[PDB]
Write a protein that binds this ligand. Structure first.
Ligand SMILES: Nc1ncnc2c1ncn2[C@@H]1O[C@H](COP(=O)(O)OP(=O)(O)O)[C@@H](O)[C@H]1O
Ligand SMILES: [Mg+2]
Ligand SMILES: [Mg+2]
Lengths: 242, 322
């Protein structure tokens, strides 16, 4: 299997930055592409894992190609289309195109040109090559559920934790976080963020309550610093406003 | 390393050795290394939902499976200039071809080895939570070194061994399809793959497949007339199956398996019997087949290969052509 994780230096030297795209514009392009994938799949009633797989293909695609050369919504549609097949929840490309037409305005949908379906189909060869045919991907949801299920203190507070952390997983998908850290770690980070916002002491819900570093039971060698880093990146989406 | 990017002209194409679901299958040779490979071509322009979901399935599952008795997908290459080609280790034969060739004889010791290898692959494949669902002779490959690999994962899928959830009913080819499927089970187990292999085992001792009909009702009848009629006395849960009442065979036949196949050696026959239990819960697991007398001590690496034709690749396509 190939390596799908980059550090901060790398993410500042993507093919889009190399062609002069400012970091802020590439960050907005990825958000828009990700939310577009999320919105189309949702209206097609797709599994959350299928959306996530689509978005991860999307984020990976643009570590190898530039937004100046590949319009982001066309790629989005292509990635959802491929994710559907991979996750055994297929949607016809024609359905993805109509939904795309419905959600985008004229200029945005202009990206698909004269034959929208065939712009998606030709991109699929390139997509598959770029992700190196490594189709299987795992997401933070399953780990959030697995870990929370071993927490024991207050049924109600624990559910508030899970629900809010779930929302943060959704947010995290709009950012390069999946290019930076494994799903397990993101899962731990969103629990940590939810706990702090809810003023919950998560330690107290485990077998070792006097130990502040409660997450070591689920993942190995994750420093507090990394968790705080993930938190700030997620919190940035609640930027002043937004 | 990075698949899909190297060009197919890195290979010299020798001939079509198979026609496949989503493309032709070729024998070819690596121009650099001299290695023999098989290429499964994936056509993309003809079909309008693009890259075939079936090829996607084989790719996803084969990449998770690594075992000496399961076929290895080496890489994926493209027409560079546009189709893709799945690249596998080249296997000189498959079992359907060899059998219908009449160029080789498999004695008990060859059968010992084949079944040992096939069972270790299925066990690995079952203990990773996958069902194969299309075990039959054309999907079992054999190289000239005498090594078995289970192949054709196009119908495989994950199954839950914690929970019990429903799966597709029409999955194994008919002559190798188990009684519970024929009676309409949807919450089935890996026992359906063991039934198939039990048919292979018989088919290796006899000339032809052991249960041949053209419709499901007639097929269940054929099974019943040898394995005994499905009935609660041997299979209590049989009454909970959708088609039990509508598909009852002509008679309530008593099992006569050990009679109808008395030519099969004792140890082998015991395995055969145990693999062809009507009740899937009474059917041996792959792990259990391997603890049986017939295979328990069998070590394939220390056994000589049968003398396979070194001059003719015996695959399914070549056989039905001639
Ligand atoms: N690795 C291989 N080496 C040699 N022959 C192969 C190989 N893979 C497939 N074949 C031949 O091609 C045929 C079809 O391939 P298979 O994988 O079974 O797909 P399908 O049965 O879906 O068409 C097989 O019966 C076999 O004869
Ligand atoms: Mg096959
Ligand atoms: Mg097949």
């Amino acid at each position: 299997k190939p390596c799908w994780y980059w550090d901060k230096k790398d993410l500042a030297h993507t093919p889009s930055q190399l062609e002069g795209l400012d970091p802020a514009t590439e960050a907005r392009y990825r958000r828009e592409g990700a939310r577009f994938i999320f919105d189309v799949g949702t209206r097609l009633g797709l599994h959350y894992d299928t959306l996530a797989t689509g978005i991860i293909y999307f984020h990976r695609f643009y570590m190898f190609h530039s937004f100046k050369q590949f319009p982001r919504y066309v790629t989005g549609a292509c990635c959802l289309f491929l994710a559907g097949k991979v996750e055994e929840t297929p949607k016809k490309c024609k359905d993805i195109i109509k939904t795309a037409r419905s959600l985008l305005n004229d200029v945005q949908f202009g990206q698909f040109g004269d034959d929208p379906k065939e712009e998606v189909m030709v991109l699929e060869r390139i997509l598959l090559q770029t992700i190196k045919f490594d189709l299987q991907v795992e997401h933070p949801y399953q780990f959030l559920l697995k870990y929370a299920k071993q927490l024991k203190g207050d049924k109600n507070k624990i559910q508030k934790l899970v629900q809010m952390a779930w929302t943060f997983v959704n947010d995290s998908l709009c950012t390069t976080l999946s290019l930076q850290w494994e799903p397990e770690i993101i899962a731990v980070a969103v629990m940590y963020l939810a706990g702090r916002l809810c003023k919950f002491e998560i330690q107290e819900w485990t077998s070792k309550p006097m130990y502040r570093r409660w997450w070591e039971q689920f993942v190995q060698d994750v420093p507090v610093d990394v968790l705080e880093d993930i938190c700030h990146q997620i919190l940035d989406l609640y930027s002043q406003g937004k | 390393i990075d698949w899909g990017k190297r060009c197919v002209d890195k290979f010299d194409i020798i001939g079509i050795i198979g026609e496949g679901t989503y493309g032709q299958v070729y024998k070819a040779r690596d121009k650099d290394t001299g290695e023999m490979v098989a290429l499964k071509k994936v056509r993309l322009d003809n079909e309008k939902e693009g890259f075939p979901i079936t090829a996607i399935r084989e790719i996803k599952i084969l990449r998770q499976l690594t075992h000496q008795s399961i076929i290895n997908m080496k890489e994926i290459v493209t027409d560079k200039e546009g189709a893709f080609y799945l690249v596998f280790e080249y296997m000189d034969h498959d079992l359907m071809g060899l059998l219908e060739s009449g160029l080789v004889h498999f004695n008990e010791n060859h059968i010992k080895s084949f079944m040992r290898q096939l069972m270790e692959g299925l066990d690995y494949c079952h203990k990773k939570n996958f069902l194969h669902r299309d075990i039959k002779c054309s999907n079992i490959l054999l190289n000239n070194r005498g090594q078995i690999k289970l192949a054709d994962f196009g119908l495989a899928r994950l199954y839950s061994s914690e929970e019990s959830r429903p799966y597709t009913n029409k999955v194994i080819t008919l002559w190798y399809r188990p009684p519970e499927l024929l009676l309409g089970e949807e919450r089935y187990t890996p026992a359906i793959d063991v039934w198939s292999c039990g048919c292979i085992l018989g088919e290796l001792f006899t000339k032809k497949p052991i249960f041949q009909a053209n419709q499901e009702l007639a097929q269940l009848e054929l099974i019943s007339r040898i394995c005994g009629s499905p009935c609660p006395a041997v299979w209590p849960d049989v009454i909970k199956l959708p088609y039990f009442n509508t598909m009852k065979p002509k008679k309530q036949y008593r099992r006569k398996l050990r009679e109808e196949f008395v030519f099969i050696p004792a140890a082998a026959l015991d395995l055969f019997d145990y693999m062809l239990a009507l009740d899937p819960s009474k059917r041996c697991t792959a792990e259990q087949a391997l603890q049986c007398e017939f295979l328990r001590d069998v070590e394939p690496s220390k056994m000589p290969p049968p003398d396979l034709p070194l001059w003719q690749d015996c695959h399914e396509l070549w056989s039905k052509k001639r």
